[PDB]
Subunit: 533 residues, 3 copies
């Protein structure tokens, strides 16, 4: 007993020192492994070396910003005062310079590119103007978020699309995500057998959502997801001027789904304002999750365009939300509380994986059931429309024919040419009424037909559409905003915050419209920047 | 801002006028479409014209009954007083005339038809007498519901079975339902692949319940289901004399399942009397849903007989419930409250479809699991009975052999001939212990063997049975009254009304017996009316 | 009415007499059937005769112990006092005799058997010593439970393994269980079609858990499971000295799963001590359910070893729990309350079957989802470890290679030879991180390779391992203690007893370690007793 007591006292004495010592030993071992790999053959060890270097750089940066925050603020203070003193006369100068730059760039670039590239800018203007017209509180609007959101979208798109180094990186990332989620498909062979490919959607696609949920929960436990969310949220906060909680939600939605994204700020959902809840729902509707990215890239959809659309949507979502539901009340929640995200309560990583996996049981079931019902309804609708049309000697009437004409103006304003606007409109209808998975499937079919080659028109029916129309379609359809999905968002948000049940329902419908408009804005910028093939 | 205010004021001024104007414009457009279709080719446009005419007639009738209700009641009042004044002497005359008519019809018709047609009437009498013997409160019974229920059953059966125009309509309706639910099977190919037919029950049959639930929820939101329920309930109320809530539940169960039917009067379930709750459960047990109708017609079961059985069961259910659990306490719930059914809280049709689809997730899982367990138990029972029989040199002993002898008297009383009574008894055993899906499958096999032709007896075993026995079996087995299903009804009703948890359990067992007896009564009437082939 | 009243009075008079009369008539009929079967052909009727004789013997024994309990206690009292008076000097004599017997048996038997048979005893000592070292309260420990647990394990193993009559019985029981659960596989063909074998795990294996749950619920309703649990618990109680509730839980876990076993003492879970809750969790982790037994026997795993391991684990679980978390507080719960187990609330057997079947819906879904996620994670881990290894010119690095070296000492201490210890270590790693189903699959592959014959080493890789190593592996891996499974146990126990939510989490981790150590102890005894092939 005495020896055990002495050992316990020794352990108590060295607790912090011992933990630091063991962590340092582990880090030194990792560095030794890296250096050995570099010694033997640097070329093979290049990825590991790059990862280590970037990790060290980020850790050093974080530590310095933490410790030296006061000194940096002291250095920055005089410039802020000098700017404030001269801001009155300088604001007009800055605004004029920005307008002149916009005019010069638009004229030269787009005028040389063609007419269709300019109709996209016209559509950008039209969408923003219409959203201003039908705003909930038109009189009280803050324009800084809107302008900064559009500007950030333009800059990100310009870098990624007009620079070869920028274009290559997102392709690489898309391939990595595809492989990582393809690890899931192999793992699901065990449960459903090697004949799981017989039932593709049930036994191949849905298990990818289970694997993605597990991985996301593990990363949440470790504390990485939070880091990236904080960085992007700080960028948006320091430029757009939005509130903290909505920024954190928006940055998270780049990779997290709509159902799970509010869990980041769950503890403060009871106290959020109506505008912030509308922003949350709009961000949820305007962006897709990482799980679907691999499947959509597999269909044939471009990795670069999908990732760029997902990144660009969140600033667009916040801007459109502010222009479609401006805030009229003070925000209670603080920056420190919002940025802080409680880690998973699971004791160990494997418990976090188990809990993340179990949660996915509801989602997959709901998805499968909704798909069954809605596709059966589509079949009934087509048969009845054909029956009605036969009376008027037009047996070809269908959902697609109606939706081609109904949604054509939106496609034309986005910069799609007149002939292909109808084809894009059919896909938009599929995305709105049914989910975007079906729409991406149809788009993949059209892309494959273009790649195979052959007659553009077999008969007076067009078979495939141009590449730029496909890019604009990729941007436009990159969302979770479908009417069938309105119920699940409401139910989840009500579950997380029962007190706010009424506010969630009141603003739910406007959020879907805002998300669609945000996707359209991303598409318009893409059309402005992509050249005519 | 001023222009927006002026527009808002103008919108406020014209609200009702504007809504009426737009609705009128839409109706005028529909009428123009109909008239154009009739102009071009009337023969093709015949269905649309008929639908429009009947809809207009019903709307006019409803409006007139609403506005002119007081005048019609004033016109009707004197006749009621005149009847009441002379009722004392006239009641004996009416009863004697009815008895004489019954005697004359029975003698002529059934005596010419044969002995078996008359044993069915004998069985009708026997079942009613036995239910009177073992009633919960034999002394206090109201005979008007029982007599009116039997009479309405007889009239509906006579019209549908003995009139060619009546017979054709239900066949048409069954075909329509089959097609509408076959739209579901096509829609479920997407989720489970084109190889979904490999697993028929899991991937073909169960999805039909999901599609049916979605459609029923949408129609509930629109307000049609309620209209039909109200009409049939009013008929039963004005003739049988039952209470409002039980009548509404009974009329709804013609097409709605047992689990979902109480949701029509959910708000008042806490306050219903014990007799009314017994009536609710009995109606649930004695009738089948619309989802199963398409499958059962597909197996080979007659559409006309299935629909006629479903329609006839509800009056039989109410009559048998009143004779098996007569009411001893005053009914609190009013006619207006009961007839009124709250529409779905879903904001839009698509939300209603989503909510209806999500609810079906539990039901399909419970059904599949119960089927697995109970069929495995049947396999074990057969193997052990064969093992026991081998000791006594009878290795053929099985569940079917025991159930053929046990249930034979019920089949004989229903009017089935002696030879086929055992075959019907096997099916009744399958229906009672396991669900009626298996029983309908066996019945379909026997029907197919009859249709193919061949030896009636391959050896001293009969292979197929006569057509009339099949009709009586179709009527007898048309129910959801199985012992495995007792749990789900109790759980659902307890969920809807937690306060009444004890009353639900106390009367649950008697309800199953009452439902079986009601199915037997429908079968007896069918046997009385169907001629010997 | 008067006749009904007279009949009711007559029924009231004879209630108990009538029930006894009918039960006696049924029993007499059963005896008549048995005697007829014996008359015709005794040899065929032998199983029925044996079952009847044993049932009669047990009923007579139970009745006599009930009625004559006081007389038996009176007879036993003097001997207890005489033993207590002389216990002071006799305890040393008894302990010395036991030690001398242990020494003599160990020397003769194991020394003749070989070195490996003795390293197993050494490992037994090592595991017990280590558990004593790292105990929660090392100072306060009761050694009687530990010593009695080890002794009972040794006696059961000796009987079952070293006696031919003992060995044959468990093989017979395993075959019976396999057949009874194979009844399930046939019954599940209906729901998933005859092509259900295409997806083996989803459509063949998981349905066996549904059938097992249904059967267990029915037996719980009837009152058999409880009888066996009480008998085994009384044995453990009268020898080990443990508390009642933990003994009841431990005896139940021989055949009941971890998720469902606490339901036996659910009503008193709010009041159990921390030590008893740790014992419950340890018993849950150290034993497998009956559902998996048929599958594992089908793979090729020996029936006798599996059943012996399951039986031996529970005393080991209790002993290791007492040595790893000794009790420091008084136990409130009484023997009578704990032994009594409330029967199912279901009114009839079929309701119990339905309720048992419905409960399984959650378990199968959780199992399937966890398997998908964890196997996908294994695939990712292997690919990344291979990628890292390629840098150091060792592309074969994998999870298996690391786990072979990490877990080798445990396998060596269990008595496995040096060459096969690595192969066993791989299986132990599979069991710990992933569930034991995968590990048993790999073990079945190795057994099949041994049985086919061929090169022991195709190259410098060993292909199959010796029979004794397979037996030790069968004992070692016979558990539900996997890290993925930690979450489900916590969630279920928290659901049953919400008040104790914190105590459940605090002691959850130690329980898994204790369960693994208990499995290792069973393996060590098996290695000590099994001879070298
Ligand atoms: C070649 C391509 C063509 C050019 C495309 C343009 C690309 C530029 C992309 C993005 C820049 C978008 C700037 C939007 C300015 C919003 C003005 C506003 O009301 O808030 C003001 C922001 O204060 C500023 O004005 C700062 C502006 C810095 C500009 C950086 C570039 C003051 O904020 P407040 O006091 O809180 O009110
Ligand atoms: C050719 C086929 C053979 C004939 C088959 C018969 C087919 C007839 C089918 C259905 C008619 C069934 C009539 C049942 C009468 C129940 C008597 C009763 O107690 O309540 C009475 C109903 O008052 C009546 O008696 C009205 C009867 C109208 C009969 C319409 C036909 C008085 O009600 P109460 O004052 O509230 O008490
Ligand atoms: C041939 C094979 C080789 C031999 C292997 C051995 C196989 C023997 C297997 C099992 C016997 C294990 C006996 C363990 C004794 C524990 C001692 C203890 O502290 O509690 C004591 C138990 O009192 C006893 O000592 C009773 C012992 C009876 C022995 C039956 C055999 C007193 O209890 P307490 O007063 O409550 O304190
Ligand atoms: C299986 C996938 C590819 C699919 O078919 O998606 C259809 C609908 O499922 C919703 N969804 C999906 C994933 C998610 N997190 O991973 N959250 C969601 O809400 C979302 O509305 C979408 O449209
Ligand atoms: C899939 C269908 C054809 C089936 O196999 O039915 C078996 C059992 O499922 C119950 N059931 C079914 C549908 C329903 N609403 O659509 N409510 C119910 O309660 C009912 O007891 C029946 O016997
Ligand atoms: C389908 C079976 C063979 C399987 O693959 O099992 C994997 C994991 O499922 C857990 N499990 C299983 C059954 C049960 N009662 O029958 N209770 C449980 O907890 C347990 O942890 C095991 O490791």
């Amino acid at each position: 007993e005495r020896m055990c007591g002495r050992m316990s006292d020794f352990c108590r004495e060295h607790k912090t020192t011992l933990r630091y010592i063991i962590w340092g030993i582990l880090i030194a071992g990792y560095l030794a492994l890296v250096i050995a790999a570099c010694v033997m053959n640097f070329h093979r060890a290049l990825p590991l070396f790059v990862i280590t270097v970037v990790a060290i750089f980020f850790v050093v940066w974080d530590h310095l910003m933490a410790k030296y925050e006061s000194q940096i603020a002291r250095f920055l203070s005089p410039g802020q005062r000098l700017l404030d003193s001269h801001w009155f006369w300088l604001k007009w100068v800055i605004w004029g310079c920005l307008i002149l730059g916009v005019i010069l760039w638009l004229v030269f670039d787009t005028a040389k590119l063609g007419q269709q590239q300019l109709v996209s800018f016209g559509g950008l203007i039209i969408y923003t103007s219409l959203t201003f017209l039908f705003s909930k509180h038109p009189t009280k609007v803050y324009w800084r978020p809107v302008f900064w959101g559009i500007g950030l979208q333009f800059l990100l798109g310009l870098l990624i699309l007009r620079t070869e180094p920028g274009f290559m990186a997102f392709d690489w990332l898309g391939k990595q995500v595809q492989t990582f989620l393809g690890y899931s498909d192999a793992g699901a062979s065990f449960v459903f057998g090697e004949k799981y490919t017989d039932h593709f959607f049930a036994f191949k696609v849905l298990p990818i959502v289970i694997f993605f949920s597990t991985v996301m929960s593990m990363l949440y436990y470790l504390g990485l997801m939070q880091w990236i969310i904080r960085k992007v949220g700080w960028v948006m906060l320091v430029t757009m001027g939005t509130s903290p909680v909505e920024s954190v939600v928006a940055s998270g939605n780049i990779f997290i789904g709509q159902t799970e994204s509010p869990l980041l700020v769950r503890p403060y959902l009871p106290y959020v304002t109506k505008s912030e809840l509308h922003a949350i729902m709009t961000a949820g509707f305007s962006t897709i999750a990482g799980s679907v990215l691999g499947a959509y890239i597999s269909f044939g959809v471009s990795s670069s365009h999908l990732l760029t659309a997902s990144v660009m949507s969140a600033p667009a979502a916040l801007a459109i939300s502010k222009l479609f539901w401006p805030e009229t009340e003070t925000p209670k929640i603080n920056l420190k509380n919002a940025m802080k995200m409680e880690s998973g309560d699971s004791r160990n990583l494997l418990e976090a994986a188990t809990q993340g996996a179990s949660s996915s049981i509801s989602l997959v079931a709901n998805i499968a059931v909704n798909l069954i019902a809605f596709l059966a309804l589509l079949s009934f609708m087509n048969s009845a429309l054909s029956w009605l049309g036969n009376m008027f000697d037009y047996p070809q009437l269908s959902f697609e024919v109606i939706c081609s004409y109904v949604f054509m103006p939106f496609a034309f304003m986005m910069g799609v040419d007149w002939q292909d606007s109808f084809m894009v409109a059919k896909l938009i209808g599929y995305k709105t009424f049914f989910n975007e998975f079906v729409a991406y499937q149809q788009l993949s079919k059209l892309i494959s037909l273009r790649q195979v080659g052959g007659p553009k028109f077999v008969d007076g029916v067009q078979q495939y559409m141009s590449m730029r129309s496909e890019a604009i379609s990729t941007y436009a359809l990159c969302g979770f905003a479908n009417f069938g999905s309105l119920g699940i968002v409401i139910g989840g948000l009500t579950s997380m915050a029962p007190s706010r049940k009424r506010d969630i329902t009141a603003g739910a419908m406007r959020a879907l419209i805002a998300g669609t408009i945000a996707c359209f804005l991303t598409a318009c910028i893409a059309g402005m920047l992509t050249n005519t093939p």
